[PDB]
């Protein structure tokens, strides 16, 4: 019912947290300096913890049971194994949280012999014990985002809340091959995760086509994490059980369900007594597993109470999208409160209320959305694309402070047909590696369910195979991306995009200078910088292939 209990004791930094940054060289150009970007921290802590904590008033119905009934019948069709003690130590990042008993990621991915056997006796006090609550830990994360003056006032930090090191551990040895399974299984080509930039493109652009009047929505539920029940947690786990698992696994998944997944108590970085959770903990390996698949289930059978007509959806966490028969705009918005208020029933409220769409363009799915523009033979060419603003906000923070890992190397990879990738991004960082000549350093950066790690010197390649010879010739953008990279640019206090163009001449200039691969980038990333532009042949692209 309540999301949260607390006790008084603050949610307190582990470190001393940094809010703005003393220059910041993305945003400044010879007589124009500026400076809008800022890092959530701990100070905004109780502000986030007062939106999130409140009363869960949760109400089913056939339609509900229904859906969970197929669902559940998808995943008696998934079979998952245990993970082995050394898998699951391979699987720990390089540098997650440390456990307080002796030990770091370093221990245990190298299988020191402290951090096995503590993990060996966290498994089997999951075998024995499935009531005790495992305490965990709630931090206030630090993500850096731009002022939008006119949308409100700077963010309040996001929670976070996990278990120790040794039980993170054992989540993977349980649940790990489900992670990887069930969630395709159930809700197939909706299963928003599975698809790389030009496959989501193709989803949204087919699923647009193939309605005769189409209309869509992107639901944006109200504190997800906050209102997912205990009910909700449980019914997650009856549908991991629907899976072929093998005994130890379901004795150790209930532990974990009943002691960890259902709710617990809270400790700040002090050890202090923090509060109680009754909701979806942030830092759990099912998290993203558990929001997904109760997200398409609620809103499946959302959609039969509320009437929508032929719906195909698209889940990514607590982000979701769907695409029907339009009813005309007068029942489309009928259909659509509809829909909400069967969505709120099932405690699933929505933050901004949900409006309908008739352009594709203007449907943002997994943050993204899907644009148009003209390749070089003149014919149109569909690309992902979204908002700059916090994206480039990040890409002038991790410019000063230099992070292990790196935000915009995964833009640039991600976006690399965007205007604002091209024109801003590469302009910048390649501008800036020259500076500080580095450039055939590797760099790591993220795309989820890793970490990779990636040579600048080797992007022109990286681009082609992911999205093509194209991303290196689009022009002619439209109107409507122009104008949202042109306003990001704004609220940013950065150069408009014409002074990015004069600036990449000489970027490219210096590139070509060097030779080799560096020459190639100069050739292939910048030929948009020039009036008469090159020829660009395939490279050595047929050479990798990805996994995220």
């Known amino acids: 019912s309540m999301s949260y209990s607390w006790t008084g004791a603050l949610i307190t930094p582990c470190s001393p947290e940094e809010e703005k940054l003393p220059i910041n060289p993305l945003s400044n150009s010879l007589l124009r300096y500026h400076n809008k970007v800022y890092c959530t921290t701990s100070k905004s802590a109780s502000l986030r913890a007062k939106k999130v904590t409140f009363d869960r008033m949760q109400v089913l119905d056939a339609y509900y049971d229904s859906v969970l009934k197929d669902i559940k019948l998808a995943a008696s069709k998934v079979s998952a194994r245990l993970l082995t003690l050394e898998e699951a130590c391979q699987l720990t990042p390089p540098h997650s949280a440390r456990s307080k008993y002796g030990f770091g990621a370093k221990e245990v991915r190298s299988l020191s012999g402290r951090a096995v056997n503590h993990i060996k006796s966290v498994w089997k006090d999951l075998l024995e014990d499935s009531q005790t609550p495992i305490p965990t830990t709630i931090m206030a994360k630090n993500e850096v985002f731009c002022v939008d003056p006119t949308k409100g006032g700077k963010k309040a930090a996001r929670l976070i809340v996990y278990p120790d090191l040794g039980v993170r551990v054992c989540e993977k040895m349980a649940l790990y091959d489900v992670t990887q399974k069930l969630p395709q299984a159930v809700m197939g080509a909706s299963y928003g995760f599975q698809y790389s930039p030009a496959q989501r493109v193709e989803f949204l652009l087919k699923a647009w086509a193939e309605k005769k009047d189409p209309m869509g929505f992107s639901y944006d539920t109200r504190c997800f994490d906050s209102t997912v029940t205990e009910r909700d947690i449980r019914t ?3 549908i991991y059980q629907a899976c072929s698992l093998p005994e130890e696994a379901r004795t150790a998944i209930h532990s974990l369900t009943e002691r960890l997944y259902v709710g617990g108590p809270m400790f700040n970085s002090k050890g202090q007594s923090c509060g109680y959770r009754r909701c979806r903990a942030s830092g759990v390996l099912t998290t993203s597993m558990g ?4 997200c398409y289930v609620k809103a499946l059978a959302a959609c039969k109470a509320a009437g929508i007509v032929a719906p195909t959806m698209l889940v990514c966490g607590d982000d979701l999208v769907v695409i029907s028969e339009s009813q005309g705009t007068e029942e489309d918005e009928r259909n659509l409160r509809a829909f909400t208020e069967a969505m ?8 901004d209320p949900p409006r309908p769409e008739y352009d594709l363009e203007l449907i943002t799915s997994c943050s993204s959305n899907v644009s148009v523009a003209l390749g070089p033979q003149g014919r149109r060419r569909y690309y992902l694309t979204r908002d700059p603003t916090t994206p480039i ?11 292990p890992v790196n935000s915009w190397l995964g833009n640039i990879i991600q976006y690399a047909p965007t205007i604002w990738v091209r024109m801003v991004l590469m302009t910048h960082f390649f501008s800036i590696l020259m500076a500080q000549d580095t450039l055939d350093q ?4 993220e795309m989820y369910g890793s970490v990779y790690s990636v040579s600048p010197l080797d992007l022109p390649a990286i681009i082609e195979r992911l999205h093509g010879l194209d991303a290196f010739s689009l022009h002619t953008y439209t109107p409507h991306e122009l104008t949202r990279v042109a306003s990001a640019l704004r609220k940013l206090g950065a150069p408009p995009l014409r ?3 004069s600036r990449a001449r000489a970027v ?28 660009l042949t395939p490279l050595p692209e047929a050479r990798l292939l990805d996994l995220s």
């Open 236 to 238: 997650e786990e009856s």
């Open 499 to 501: 002074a990015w163009k």
């Open 344 to 351: 709120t029933r099932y405690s699933a409220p929505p933050g």
């Open 291 to 294: 929001n997904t698949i109760t």
């Open 508 to 535: 490219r200039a210096s590139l070509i200078s060097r030779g080799g691969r560096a020459a190639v980038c100069g050739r292939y990333l910048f030929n948009w910088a020039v009036k008469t532009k090159l020829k």
């Open 393 to 403: 906000a990040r890409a002038a923070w991790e410019t000063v402070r230099h992070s």
């Open 442 to 445: 590797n760099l790591n950066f």
